Structure 1
């Protein structure tokens, strides 16, 4: 069960490394708003963790409840660990990323848990363009 919960932190490690690298000018002026809308999502994760901390001090957070909590968020956080590892790989900037992220909302059109994130992320990456 730990090995089922463990992919969340791996799908977090290459998301903060998206924020703290893709904020750079050199990656372009589309990777700026790309990583300011992947910074917002990490703050959302930080909200979840705090609520669960308040639960855990009262003896009221256990592995089952946590596993129920995070399972909608493995269609949230794990999606970020894929777009980050395709945009960073090679050289994708500007319009090339934005086609690659229009290609990745046709790879999520039946889940609806991931699709809302794809639409938000490409609604922020379309703004400087």
Structure 2
């Protein structure tokens, strides 16, 4: 639910593409806040191991930003080239930012947090990713 501000005086040929990259950040600022909260004991032994296994992916998302900066030094990283690199991250951090907002909507802990991971796995019966 994060809102962003870009620039009053910027090229329109950029701002329309900037707004196409940010939905991986706003969908990230709601996962990292799900980890640092649903780790509190008063949430059961399921909402914990769900937050741990939801952390290894955040680690692999931090490596994907490191390899971009090291590739940015050689100047080989154009803005158009960026929109294609993060596509695996725009799909994954869009799945977790939907569970972390649907487990906290209706307060779930224990079995009712293990049911939601069994229906949200049935809807993607043709995605295979």
**Range into which the TM-score falls when normalised by the shorter chain:** 0.7 to 0.9
Total equivalences in the alignment: 111
> 4+ residue stretches of structure 1 with deviation over 2 A?
none
CA RMSD of aligned residues (A): 0.9
Alpha-carbon offset, residue 62 of structure 1 = 1.4
State the TM-score, normalized to the length of structure 1.
0.83
Max radius of gyration: which structure? 2
Distance 2:38 2:57 in 1: 15
Alpha-carbon offset, residue 28 of structure 1 = 1.1
**Aligned: 1:21 with 2:37:** yes
Distance 1:5 1:40 in 2: 22
Q: Hey, which of these two has a bigger chunk of helix by percent?
A: 1
Q: Deviations over 1:8-49 (max 9, x none)?
A: 001101100111001111111111111111111110100100
Distance 1:65 1:76 in 2: 19
1:37 alignment partner in structure 2: 53
Mapping of residues 1-129 of structure 1, within 5 Å: 1-111=17-127
| Structure 1 unaligned spans of 5+ | 112-129
State the TM-score, normalized to the length of structure 2.
0.83
